[PDB]
């Protein structure tokens, strides 16, 4: 049983730039002078695409700008100049034994100029408030890391293990990330309660910016 | 060309069973390994297993050895995996790639994938609730509105705006599996706020595995049965009567301009003497005047002569929430000059049976009506006096009336009272009456 | 529990027939007799006739004898009214009610009425049109809104407000006839302003002729899909007149107080304008807001009353706008029936210095009037005068008001003798009406 | 038949006020110790209701403030301290005799103090002016007296023959009326012209009321 571990796991980058993504295995996969390691390309909602195999020969179809390197246990897959539709999730892959196993997979982002959130808060409906439940949304909109944190307040009072988060693929024009952070209540626990609140830490922002509303006030 | 062809989406309950095909085509099918590879939601690839066609030899991965079983059709060159015992954590897309059997050279050829539900949901439509603003009125040009997809199973849902038409700052985000089982979305669109009650907003969320569709109208044009919850205008103040009159005094044009928005927050002011644009305006910056208005002043000094020859200050006003430009023009009242008769009466024979007197000073014959009248006592101003608005007599001219209301005692002990009068058509802008108890 | 319930409404043609049933319960069906009573458009109560459900036994008023037919039905209790041969005129609301037996005590219990119209036009539903107002201003604390229900035919139509849950303030007119056959009529309800956008408002009409039902919205809440235009509705403002209650002394001064409330949290700052008459005034104590306690603020004025401004009838008006809203929400008050102050009428002659001219000055002071609404003329020996202006009121000090009226004479009518008056007419003078006296002494 | 005279036609009185109906049969209707003569109360849009039988019994469930009187050819009701709710038309009925016949009626009025109408103005819905038609609607709302008049300007033209009035009976609790007039106008008519004014006249407004409002800023 060979396990792999890739390395950066997110390699953040301008198109133009070189991508070295690691692969290490916990023993040699090296065997009668070839080494049993491959590397794969994986774009959102697409199967994985071979592009090297035996660790350095170029598979058919495949652009000369992807090239891999190495013996034993360090592999290194190079991208000599990214291009847009190298943005992907790349996967490495060992055969030398029996289970086949592939590593963690390395996501090349695009690198881009800071970028603060545009944050927006909505209410729950009327129409989802008869229902017995209460959904709360608070929106992060075309910002950039995708790193943010969002804390949810009622009256003051940090909310936990009652939320759910979900980010937009950087988008294809701008190369931009935006979030959405749902905080879901009953109507009895929401009915309870008078103000909501979501505060945005981010990179872009200098102090959290933090959008509210009150229950009643709508 | 080589080709693997998947077949299609499954959803199944836990402890079910499910076989996903492969069809291969476009190669010696026999000459290849075929593997099997999924991928939970989110997550890596996990290598299954692999079965050999030529002979049906098959090796797996120690997780999946007693669960799969893998079969092969050379006839047909389709390759099958058949996963039993479902269990929630199955939930991915599984697919089929095939591998060289002589040399080792990876996985080339990859079907496209098979996406399987483990579940015990329970086929669902959405309900779709809109995302709006609690309180869009603000200062701020962009506004996000959106739907919220809850509750439906299994997935897919696909969301458009408006039919199709509205695809530019839509955001349609990746689904959320809640405690429940059921999914959850949300799409958002930042569209420009003066938009809002001008456009329709609209979603057309389509949920095929349960035949539903909803067009939800998240946001409608303004009027009824809507409960129901104008631009920039110009004011221009001419200086003061005293301080056009006297040469120690200073007098301004003041232009105020009120009702400017939130938004459209200029201050562009340009002034003219009689046509010819000056630049020695001193403007004040902008205020917020408790309404969701801004309020900005500009204040043109002008030189005595300038305002007593007539002269015409015009204050042009630009902003860009304007179709054109506002202007407002002031200058002193036009015609021939006529000189003020100053006169004072003393308190009526039947006032004097009161506490308090009136001394009263009669101003007749002026024009224009710009004028200023006070009193004096001995060698002193006075302040308990009220003046009349000017009043247009038959003849062209005003008069006015200003009334000192004094103490008997103050005007039966004697003290001298003196009305003055400020006009432009007096000597020196001025003059001054006596009134006394005879 | 004694019942009499008729059937529903019907539209039949001339030389056709109509029959009315009446369902008795909750007493013995035999022991009445039913008897038909009809009321025709613009007409008073018609005996029709009578049956006596033990035998069947009948009488009938000779006027439709011939054309009615009165039958009972002894399992389901009920008596039906058939009328034959039908005639334009035969348009009515048709009754039974019930007579005992034994004794004539009167017809004690009737049922609901049936309409019926004899008509050869053809039915037709009403369009429902919802009756809202065109963008509603500040500071009306009533709106109303309602439903058109237009060309119909026949009568009646019924009307309620949101299912019958909403009945105070509600008016349904009387239909009226157009020049085309055919009728419509209105329905209105009225509401605090507060209140829209709150509630929603639906008008429920039914036309059973045409088996038309329809639920017309009038007015949504505020709450998408209504574009959001600041939230609540709006801050409410209440403007207190001078009390309170308890105790003494000579503190007391009394106060005129605004107080205003639902001012969000997110647009706290208020500013508070106050005039009266008017006119702005700047004394006022404006008290620093206060969270207490919901959730909202609230921010309270109070205006110390000056002279006897109260007593006078004064307008007190308070503004009140809150920063990040668009408008500013107004209140006046004032004592229903005020007490004016009556004016003080001064004649004074010509300056000496003005008797050197050809044409001199007859002045009238008038002062210490309320209200400013004055009219003051001149005359020379009784006979009204040509050529004299007034000055309008100016607000004096102790709150009332002054003026001055000059008449302009030739110094030769001075001089010898004439009579001049200044006439004034205002609401606190004996018959409206005082004149002073001027003459060269 | 017998003819039953009913006097007055009209009555107005204050709430306390006692009321006298007379009624008059043109023959007895008095036999054996019974006077076969009873008394209704109609109210709007309801049956008549039975307060008096036999000239003088009072129906179980009437109020004692109602009490009839009289023999023989003369009758009469008495409602001794009037309530707001007493408004309605009261008749007087026989059985000496077929025909069985009612009097005429008399109608109770209840006097009140002077209200001045509320007056609200209601543009044409654009769902009506889909239709070629458009209906102008102004709101005279709890008045006293009936007395109003209703004046409509369209861009300061008086407007005739193109008009209809309805006034509701006197409202059981407050004594007030309210009146709803419509302005009928062909769509293109409608559109052709800006400003349209409700002007109102009543004794309770010193002055008259006009409310108005611009087509196109609605
Ligand atoms: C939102 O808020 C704005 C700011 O107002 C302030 O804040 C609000 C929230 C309230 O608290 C207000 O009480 C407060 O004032 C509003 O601005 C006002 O807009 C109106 C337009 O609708 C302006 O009206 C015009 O006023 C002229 C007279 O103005 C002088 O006198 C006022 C007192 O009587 C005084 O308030 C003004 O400041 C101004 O005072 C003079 O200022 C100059 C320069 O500083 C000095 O040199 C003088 O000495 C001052 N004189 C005095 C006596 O103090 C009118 O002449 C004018 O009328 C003419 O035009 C109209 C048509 O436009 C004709 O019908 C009329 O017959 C005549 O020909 C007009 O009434 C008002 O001045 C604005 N106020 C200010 C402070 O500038 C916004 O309107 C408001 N927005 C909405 C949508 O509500
Ligand atoms: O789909 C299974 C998969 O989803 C997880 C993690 O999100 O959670 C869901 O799993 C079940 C779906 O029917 C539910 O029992 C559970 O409440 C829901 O959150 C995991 O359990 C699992 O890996
Ligand atoms: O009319 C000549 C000349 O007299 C004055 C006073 O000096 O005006 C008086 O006569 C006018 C005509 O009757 C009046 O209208 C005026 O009120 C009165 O003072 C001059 O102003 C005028 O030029
Ligand atoms: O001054 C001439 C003439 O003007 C009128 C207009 O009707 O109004 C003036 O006098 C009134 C009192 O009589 C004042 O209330 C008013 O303000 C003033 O302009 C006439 O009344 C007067 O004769």
């Known amino acids: 049983e060979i396990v792999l571990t890739q390395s950066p796991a997110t390699l953040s980058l301008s198109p133009g730039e070189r991508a070295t993504l690691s692969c290490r295995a916990s023993?040699?996969?090296?065997?009668?002078?070839?080494?049993?390691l491959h590397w794969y390309q994986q774009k959102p909602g697409q199967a994985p695409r071979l592009l090297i195999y035996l660790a350095s020969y170029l598979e058919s179809g495949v652009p000369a700008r992807f090239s891999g390197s190495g013996s034993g246990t360090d592999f290194t897959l190079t991208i000599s100049s990214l291009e847009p539709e190298d943005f992907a999730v790349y996967y490495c892959?060992?055969?030398?034994?029996?289970?086949?196993?592939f590593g963690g997979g390395t996501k090349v982002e695009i690198k881009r100029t800071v970028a603060a959130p545009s944050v927006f808060i909505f209410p729950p409906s009327d129409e989802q408030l008869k229902s017995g439940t209460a959904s709360v949304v608070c929106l992060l909109n075309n910002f950039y890391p995708r790193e943010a944190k969002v804390q949810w307040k009622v009256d003051n009072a940090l909310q936990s293990g009652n939320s759910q988060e979900s980010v937009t693929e950087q988008d294809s024009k701008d190369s931009t990330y935006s979030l959405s952070s749902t905080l879901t209540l009953s109507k009895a626990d929401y009915e309870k309660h008078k103000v909501y609140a979501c505060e945005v830490t981010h990179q872009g922002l200098s102090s959290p910016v933090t959008k509210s509303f009150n229950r009643g006030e709508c | 060309q080589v080709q693997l062809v998947q077949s299609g989406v499954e959803v199944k309950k836990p402890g079910a069973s499910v076989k996903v095909s492969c069809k291969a085509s476009?190669?010696?099918?026999?000459?290849?390994?075929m593997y099997w590879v999924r991928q939970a939601p989110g997550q890596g690839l996990e290598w299954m297993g692999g079965?050999?066609?030529?002979?049906?030899?098959?090796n797996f991965n120690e997780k999946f050895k007693n669960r799969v079983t893998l079969t092969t059709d050379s006839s047909t060159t389709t390759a099958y995996m058949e996963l039993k015992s479902l269990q929630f954590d199955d939930t991915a897309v599984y697919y089929c790639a095939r591998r060289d059997y002589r040399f080792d050279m990876g996985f080339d050829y990859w079907g496209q994938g098979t996406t399987v539900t483990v579940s015990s949901a329970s086929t669902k439509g959405p309900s779709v609730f809109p995302l709006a603003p609690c309180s869009r009125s603000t200062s701020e040009s962009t506004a996000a509105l959106g739907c919220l997809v809850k509750d439906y199973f299994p997935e897919p849902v696909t969301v458009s705006w408006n039919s199709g038409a509205l695809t530019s700052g839509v955001h349609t985000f990746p689904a959320v599996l809640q405690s429940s089982g059921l999914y959850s979305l949300s799409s958002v669109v930042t569209v420009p706020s003066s938009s809002l009650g001008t456009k329709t907003y609209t979603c057309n969320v389509d949920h095929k595995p349960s035949n539903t569709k909803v067009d939800k109208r998240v946001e409608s044009k303004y009027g009824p049965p809507c409960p129901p919850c104008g631009g920039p205008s110009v004011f221009l103040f001419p200086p003061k009567p005293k301080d056009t009159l006297m040469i120690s005094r200073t007098p301004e044009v003041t232009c105020v301009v009120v009702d400017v928005s939130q938004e459209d927050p200029e201050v562009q002011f340009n002034w003219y003497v009689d046509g010819v644009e000056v630049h020695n305006a001193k403007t004040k910056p902008r205020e917020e005047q408790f309404n969701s208005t801004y309020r900005v002043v500009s204040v043109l000094t002008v030189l005595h002569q300038d305002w007593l020859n007539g002269k015409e200050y015009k204050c042009k006003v630009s902003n860009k929430g304007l179709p054109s430009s506002i202007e407002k023009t002031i200058s002193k009242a036009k015609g021939q000059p006529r000189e003020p008769q100053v006169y004072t009466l003393p308190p009526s024979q039947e006032e004097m049976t009161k506490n308090q007197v009136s001394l009263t000073c009669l101003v007749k014959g002026f024009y224009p009506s710009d004028i200023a009248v006070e009193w004096e006592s001995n060698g002193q101003p006075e302040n308990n006096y009220k003046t009349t608005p000017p009043v247009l007599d038959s003849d062209g001219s005003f008069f006015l009336y200003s009334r000192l209301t004094v103490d008997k005692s103050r005007w039966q002990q004697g003290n001298v009272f003196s009305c003055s009068v400020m006009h432009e058509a007096l000597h020196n802008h001025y003059t001054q009456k006596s009134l006394s108890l005879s | 529990q004694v019942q009499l319930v008729q059937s529903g409404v019907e539209v039949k043609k001339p030389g056709a027939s109509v029959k009315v049933s009446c369902?008795?319960?909750?007493?013995?069906?035999?022991?009445?007799?039913?008897?038909?009573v009809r009321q025709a458009p613009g007409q008073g109560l018609e005996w029709?006739?009578?049956?006596?459900?033990?035998?069947?036994?009948?009488?009938?008023?000779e006027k439709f004898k011939n054309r009615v037919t009165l039958t009972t039905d002894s399992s389901t209790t009920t008596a039906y009214m058939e009328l034959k041969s039908l005639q334009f005129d035969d348009t009515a609301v048709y009754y039974c009610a019930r007579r005992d037996y034994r004794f004539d005590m009167g017809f004690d219990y009737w049922g609901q009425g049936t309409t019926v119209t004899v008509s050869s036009a053809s039915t037709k539903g009403p369009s429902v049109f919802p009756l809202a107002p065109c963008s509603r201003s500040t500071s009306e604390s009533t709106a109303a809104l309602g439903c058109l229900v237009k060309d119909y035919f026949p009568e009646p139509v019924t009307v309620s407000w949101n299912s019958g849950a909403l009945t105070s303030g509600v008016h349904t007119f009387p239909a009226v006839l157009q020049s085309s056959g055919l009728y419509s009529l209105s329905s209105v309800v009225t509401v605090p302003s507060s209140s829209l956008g709150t509630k929603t408002y639906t008008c429920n009409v039914d036309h059973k002729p045409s088996n038309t039902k329809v639920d017309k919205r009038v007015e949504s809440k505020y709450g998408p899909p209504c574009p959001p235009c600041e939230f609540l509705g709006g801050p409410s403002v209440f403007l207190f007149p001078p009390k309170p209650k308890d105790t003494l002394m000579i503190s007391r001064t009394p106060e005129v107080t605004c107080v205003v409330v639902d001012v969000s949290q997110e647009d706290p700052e208020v500013q508070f304008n106050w005039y009266v008459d008017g006119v702005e005034v700047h004394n006022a104590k404006t008290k620093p807001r206060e969270e207490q306690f919901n959730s909202t603020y609230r921010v309270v004025s109070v205006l110390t009353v000056l002279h006897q401004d109260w007593l006078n009838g004064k307008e007190y008006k308070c503004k009140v706008s809150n920063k990040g809203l668009p408008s500013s929400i107004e209140k006046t008050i004032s004592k229903a029936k005020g007490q004016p102050r009556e004016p003080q009428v001064y004649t004074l002659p010509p300056s000496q210095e003005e008797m050197t001219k050809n044409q001199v000055s007859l002045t009238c002071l008038v002062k210490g009037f309320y209200p400013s609404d004055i009219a003051v003329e001149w005359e020379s020996n009784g006979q009204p005068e040509n050529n004299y202006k007034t000055t309008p009121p100016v607000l004096d000090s102790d709150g009332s008001f002054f003026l001055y009226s000059r008449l302009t004479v030739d110094k030769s009518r001075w001089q010898q003798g004439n009579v001049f008056s200044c006439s004034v007419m205002h609401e606190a003078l004996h018959n409206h009406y005082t004149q002073k006296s001027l003459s060269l002494s | 038949e017998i003819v039953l005279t009913q006097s007055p036609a009209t009555l107005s009185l204050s709430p306390g006020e006692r009321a006298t109906l007379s009624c008059?049969?043109?023959?007895?209707?008095?036999?054996?110790?019974?006077?076969?003569?009873?008394?209704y109360q109609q109210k709007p849009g309801q049956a008549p209701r039975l307060l008096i039988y036999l000239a003088s019994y009072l129906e179980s469930g009437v109020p004692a403030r109602f009490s009839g009187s009289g023999s023989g050819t003369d009758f009469t009701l008495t409602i001794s301290s009037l309530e707001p709710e007493d408004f309605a038309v009261?008749?007087?009925?026989?059985?000496?005799?077929?025909?069985?016949?009612?009097?005429?009626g008399t109608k109770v009025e209840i006097k009140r103090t002077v209200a001045a109408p509320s007056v609200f103005i209601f543009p044409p819905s654009d769902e009506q002016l889909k239709s070629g038609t458009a209906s102008v609607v102004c709101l005279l709302n709890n008045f006293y007296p009936r007395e109003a008049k209703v004046q409509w300007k369209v861009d300061n033209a008086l407007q005739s023959g193109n008009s209809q009035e309805s006034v509701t009976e006197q409202d059981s609790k407050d004594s007030t009326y309210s009146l709803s007039s419509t302005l009928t106008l062909s769509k293109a008519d409608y559109e052709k012209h800006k400003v349209y004014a409700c002007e109102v006249t009543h004794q309770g407004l010193s002055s008259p009321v006009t409310k108005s409002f611009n087509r196109g800023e609605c």
């Open positions: 476009g190669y010696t099918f026999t000459n290849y390994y």
């Open positions: 892959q060992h055969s030398r034994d029996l289970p086949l196993t």
């Open positions: 079965i050999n066609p030529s002979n049906g030899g098959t």
């Open positions: 023993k040699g996969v090296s065997t009668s002078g070839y080494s049993y």
